């Protein structure tokens, strides 16, 4: 006879506790003997680089000046990236410019996205 709480872990009986969980992402699979096998394939993989020798400190000193908030406009960035290649090529078929027909073969595709955060 109580309902206003959330539906977190503790609700009712054994299996009723058993199915749901908090906000994890699943890692393995359930096979015989009620034994879970978790592959290294589906696991999270957090490989950060080496931090030695990077001179950019975590905070920025207040002695530096201020600038203008230049949002990464798609046309502006596209012009800035494709200006020299198109300028040389027209002075000289967008595959030379790198236009992607489909991202079906790339590691980090965009539509759908397969990267992480």
């Amino acid at each position: 006879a109580d309902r206003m709480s959330k539906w977190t872990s503790k609700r009712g009986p054994r299996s009723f506790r058993g199915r749901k969980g908090r906000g994890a992402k699943g890692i393995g699979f359930l096979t015989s003997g009620w034994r879970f096998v978790q592959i290294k394939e589906m696991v999270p993989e957090f490989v950060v680089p080496d931090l030695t020798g990077f001179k950019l400190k975590p905070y920025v000193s207040y002695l530096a000046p201020e600038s203008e908030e230049t949002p990464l406009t798609a046309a502006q960035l596209f012009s800035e990236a494709v200006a020299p290649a198109i300028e040389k090529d027209f002075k000289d078929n967008l595959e030379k410019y790198g236009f992607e027909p489909t991202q079906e073969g790339k590691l980090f595709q965009l539509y759908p996205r397969n990267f992480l955060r």
């Binding site: 950019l56 905070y59 600038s67 992607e100």
Partner: protein
């Protein structure tokens, strides 16, 4: 090296940690992607230091040495994330141009309202998906009176706010 899980032991007890302002977004926007990874990891370390320090301050039931430092590091990390999202959005706009980064649609749900549903990456197909076919995303005529009633409630709040604002304006002009 667990020694980084606490902050610098030298600054302990100094009542204030002399930290600079957060990195400006456009200023941070001029750094490389590898440099961006470096900045994010450094931000993670400093933020962890902040969380541990604040929780310990609660455990010691005392004030905080540098209260603005935690939120400042959070804000700088958020700005770096904004830059990362801007770059990924520029990539999505250039390469294919789809608007919402996840593929999805606008449709109607069993509550009868108009919404945008998100598709989910799943193996089996929509002609055999045992769960997705159970998703009753259809509405017969039995949603009419409730839908118009929802319109009615929306309009009631609308006229209420308008009347409140204009009458408050009338009293305000009466004050002059």
């Amino acid at each position: 090296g667990l020694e980084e899980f606490f902050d610098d032991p030298k600054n302990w007890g100094q009542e204030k940690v002399k930290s600079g302002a957060a990195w400006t977004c456009q200023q941070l926007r001029n750094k490389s992607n590898e440099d961006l990874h470096k900045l994010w990891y450094v931000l993670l370390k400093e933020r962890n230091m902040l969380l541990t320090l604040e929780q310990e301050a609660k455990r010691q039931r005392l004030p905080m040495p540098s209260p603005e430092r935690l939120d400042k590091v959070v804000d700088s990390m958020d700005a770096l994330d904004k830059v990362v999202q801007e770059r990924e959005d520029a990539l999505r706009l250039l390469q294919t141009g789809q608007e919402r980064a996840r593929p999805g649609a606008w449709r109607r749900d069993i509550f009868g309202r108009i919404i945008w549903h998100k598709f989910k990456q799943w193996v089996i197909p929509w002609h055999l998906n045992k769960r997705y076919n159970r998703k009753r995303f259809f509405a017969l005529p039995y949603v009419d009176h409730f839908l118009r009633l929802e319109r009615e409630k929306r309009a009631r709040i609308k006229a209420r706010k308008e009347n409140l604002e204009r009458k408050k304006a009338k009293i305000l002009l009466k004050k002059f």
